[PDB]
């Protein structure tokens, strides 16, 4: 029979690739269909370029792709419209904001699979040891706590110990961290939903200068090369007070044999002041049937299975990744495993999207501009003031003649 081939997630990031292969194999066994899993690189922007080689070729060699929340406007021509395959009631079982993100000129490009939000991981054992009773609410507090805990852990012999790790590599992840920095200082959304390029302002500049001030001080010098997993591995070994990352890291830190099992919590990221908005970048992944698949019926069946209640449940319970179905947020087993899903639900509801809707098919290019200018601040090459001016000019060139 047909072989249904899937590219989605990466064995280089946590358990997501191993789990995705396992779910696809489970569907193949359940339906009696042959399946193959094709692995992907870690970083989302590398995966986009890989998948684009298949799409440019109209290649039938991959039937199902796991696509980023930032991709529908880019990838729509390469997606099979799923709208005729789902009833209205089936579609209403997902969060409507995500179904809307995935719908481009009326084409339902992809089913919501899991959502994502940037959060603050913190070592609660260490906060207690150093006399703090809550995690930091402001970035100034985060800095003060990091400096104090670092001084003590270094003095006690831990040469590897840092205050804060995050994603400072030049790739999409840095755009996500930087949107949080800027938005949490009252600096805006970089490009607003209405199209205004707003980034050249003093609050955004401050945000970026502040992040530079961490590098080599409370965060490792090498943080300018860290993606999700580089940060996570410093954290997970017990060597960081704080980490910014996504929900997937929680299950991994609780695993048997994790040095930090039972020693951490999560909360909203800090902000510049009490009247700034909370910032959590909205992420997440979707399930797309290739417009070039020779087997659309089977591929749609696999996509509906992966997006189903029990597979999203398994993703929540085993991998601590956030469902796209509201009903799972009231499931007793989901909540007992991950009580913080309830505690942070409003952080997840208020998450701020990167500017993929307004940049549309040009989002790749806009984000590359953001991460490169932000990286130039983190490296010390430019100050935030210069970087936000140069970034404004670059985004202006990229989006000239683009209407939304
Ligand atoms: O493969 C899925 C896996 O990717 C992550 C990052 O490791 O996705 C998040 O981070 C990306 C940026 O690096 C975002 O573009 C994406 O939207 C966001 O979901 C993990 O969180 C996720 O489990």
């Amino acid at each position: 029979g047909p072989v249904i081939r899937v590219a989605g997630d990466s064995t280089a990031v946590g358990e997501g690739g191993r789990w995705m292969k396992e779910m696809v194999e489970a569907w193949g066994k359940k339906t009696g269909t042959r399946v193959e899993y094709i692995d992907s690189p870690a970083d989302t922007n590398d995966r986009l370029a890989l998948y684009q080689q298949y799409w440019a070729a109209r290649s039938p060699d991959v039937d199902v792709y796991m696509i980023d929340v930032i991709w529908p406007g880019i990838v729509a021509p390469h997606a099979l419209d799923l709208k005729p395959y789902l009833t209205e009631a089936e579609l209403k079982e997902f969060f409507p904001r995500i179904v809307q993100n995935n719908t481009i000129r009326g084409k339902l490009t992809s089913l919501p699979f899991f959502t994502d939000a940037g959060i603050l991981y913190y070592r609660k054992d260490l906060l207690e040891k150093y006399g703090y009773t809550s995690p930091p609410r402001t970035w100034n507090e985060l800095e003060q706590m990091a400096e104090r805990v670092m001084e003590g852990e270094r003095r006690a012999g831990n040469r590897d110990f840092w205050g804060f790790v995050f994603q400072g590599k030049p790739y999409e992840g840095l755009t996500c961290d930087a949107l949080e920095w800027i938005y949490s200082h009252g600096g805006g959304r970089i490009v607003e939903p209405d199209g205004t390029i707003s980034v050249n302002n003093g609050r955004a500049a401050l945000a970026l200068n502040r992040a530079h001030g961490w590098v080599g001080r409370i965060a490792p010098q090498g943080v300018t090369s860290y993606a999700e997993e580089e940060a996570r591995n410093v954290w997970q070994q017990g060597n960081s007070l704080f980490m910014r990352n996504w929900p997937y890291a929680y299950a991994l830190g609780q695993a048997e044999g994790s040095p930090i099992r039972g020693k951490f919590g999560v909360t909203v990221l800090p902000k510049a002041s009490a009247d700034a908005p909370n910032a959590a970048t909205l992420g997440g992944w979707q399930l797309m049937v290739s417009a070039y698949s020779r087997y659309p019926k089977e591929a749609v069946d696999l996509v509906k299975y992966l997006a189903s209640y029990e597979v999203q449940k398994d993703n929540a319970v085993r991998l601590s990744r956030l469902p796209t179905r509201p009903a799972l947020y009231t499931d007793r087993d989901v909540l007992a495993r991950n009580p913080w899903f309830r505690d942070l639900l409003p952080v997840f509801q208020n998450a701020v999207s990167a500017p993929s809707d307004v940049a549309g098919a040009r989002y790749n290019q806009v984000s590359e501009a953001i991460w490169t200018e932000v990286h130039s601040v983190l490296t010390g090459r430019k100050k935030g003031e210069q970087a936000v001016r140069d970034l404004e000019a670059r985004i202006r060139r990229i989006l000239r003649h683009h209407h939304h």
Side-chain angles (χ1 to χ4, degrees):
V3 182
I4 305 304
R5 302 185 165 84
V6 178
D9 221 322
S10 176
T11 66
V13 185
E15 287 296 323
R18 187 201 285 231
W19 176 86
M20 179 71 153
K21 181 174 176 172
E22 171 186 339
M23 301 293 96
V24 170
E25 289 172 338
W27 176 80
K29 183 197 172 149
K30 166 153 185 246
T31 60
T33 307
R34 294 196 286 159
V35 293
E36 300 181 338
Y37 181 74
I38 292 153
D39 202 4
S40 297
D43 291 353
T44 176
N45 46 289
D46 293 322
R47 303 188 201 163
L48 180 60
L50 171 65
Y51 302 170
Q52 289 177 319
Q53 296 177 34
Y54 288 96
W55 298 326
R58 303 194 160 98
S59 177
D61 291 350
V62 174
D63 297 286
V64 171
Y65 297 82
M66 196 179 89
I67 62 161
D68 200 339
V69 69
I70 50 156
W71 299 352
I74 297 165
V75 312
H78 310 308
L80 178 60
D81 188 359
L82 299 182
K83 193 70 168 64
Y85 291 93
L86 269 87
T87 67
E88 297 293 352
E90 286 171 331
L91 199 51
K92 257 41 96 212
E93 290 181 357
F94 303 104
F95 288 116
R97 157 192 199 178
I98 314 177
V99 170
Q100 179 192 333
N101 178 81
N102 295 355
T103 300
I104 298 290
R105 298 186 184 78
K107 180 186 292 198
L108 181 59
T109 66
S110 54
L111 294 194
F113 184 31
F114 60 95
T115 189
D116 239 341
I119 61 184
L120 183 70
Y121 288 73
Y122 62 96
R123 285 282 295 278
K124 66 187 171 33
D125 64 320
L126 294 178
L127 288 191
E128 179 187 272
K129 183 174 167 175
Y130 291 90
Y132 300 111
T133 51
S134 291
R137 295 175 173 91
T138 69
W139 292 114
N140 290 341
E141 281 166 9
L142 179 146
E143 290 164 3
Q144 298 156 3
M145 299 168 172
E147 282 174 4
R148 189 150 134 72
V149 176
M150 264 186 90
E151 192 282 327
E153 295 305 294
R154 289 290 181 90
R155 188 147 45 71
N158 190 355
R159 288 193 185 71
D160 298 305
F161 192 84
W162 292 90
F164 186 37
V165 296
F166 56 91
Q167 302 73 46
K169 182 181 186 183
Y171 79 126
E172 179 62 29
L174 175 52
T175 294
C176 301
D177 283 39
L179 174 62
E180 284 153 4
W181 302 329
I182 287 162
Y183 190 66
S184 77
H185 282 74
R189 287 179 177 241
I190 310 176
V191 185
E192 302 302 319
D194 65 43
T196 297
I197 300 156
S198 56
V199 73
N200 184 3
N201 70 74
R203 294 162 303 284
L206 177 58
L208 298 186
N209 289 326
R210 182 193 288 277
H212 168 255
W214 303 330
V215 177
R217 293 185 64 100
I218 59 173
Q221 301 188 56
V223 75
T224 57
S225 71
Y226 286 13
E228 278 77 8
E229 290 291 80
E230 291 72 37
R232 189 178 64 85
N233 282 312
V234 174
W235 161 258
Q236 185 140 330
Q237 290 311 112
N239 292 332
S240 195
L241 173 58
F242 298 124
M243 170 181 66
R244 180 271 178 208
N245 216 315
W246 312 95
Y248 85 100
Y250 197 107
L252 301 176
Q254 288 292 100
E256 219 70 277
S258 174
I260 60 167
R261 180 173 188 284
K263 297 186 189 308
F264 68 92
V266 290
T267 192
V268 67
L269 290 157
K271 64 197 178 172
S273 72
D275 74 342
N278 283 353
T281 292
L282 166 84
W285 296 74
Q286 337 300 320
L287 293 158
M288 185 187 90
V289 180
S290 179
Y292 316 109
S293 170
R294 297 158 295 199
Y295 318 111
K297 181 171 69 59
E298 295 88 346
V300 168
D301 197 69
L302 169 56
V303 160
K304 285 177 172 186
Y305 175 79
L306 293 171
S308 68
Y309 186 97
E310 290 289 314
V311 176
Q312 295 207 24
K313 182 169 181 169
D314 194 56
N315 202 9
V317 167
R318 294 163 71 196
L319 270 67
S320 64
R321 295 193 294 186
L322 305 181
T324 53
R325 289 164 173 287
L328 277 160
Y329 287 82
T330 57
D331 180 291
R332 70 185 205 268
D333 298 310
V334 172
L335 288 167
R337 180 55 69 85
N338 311 114
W340 55 275
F341 277 17
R342 168 207 287 126
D343 303 322
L344 295 188
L345 225 200
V347 171
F348 314 146
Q349 291 167 0
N350 290 306
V352 51
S353 51
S356 48
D357 282 354
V358 67
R362 298 187 192 191
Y363 175 70
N364 45 335
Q365 292 169 76
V366 170
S367 188
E368 177 167 48
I370 296 168
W371 79 59
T372 57
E373 295 295 337
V374 172
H375 193 254
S376 87
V377 183
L378 295 180
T379 58
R381 169 71 45 93
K382 295 188 183 188
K383 297 294 287 327
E385 296 80 353
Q386 182 192 346
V388 301
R389 185 172 65 245
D390 292 345
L391 182 54
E392 171 182 55
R394 295 176 70 172
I395 299 180
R396 283 176 70 180
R397 293 194 295 269
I398 294 160
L399 297 178
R400 193 139 326 112
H401 309 307
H402 183 78
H403 308 291
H404 37 287

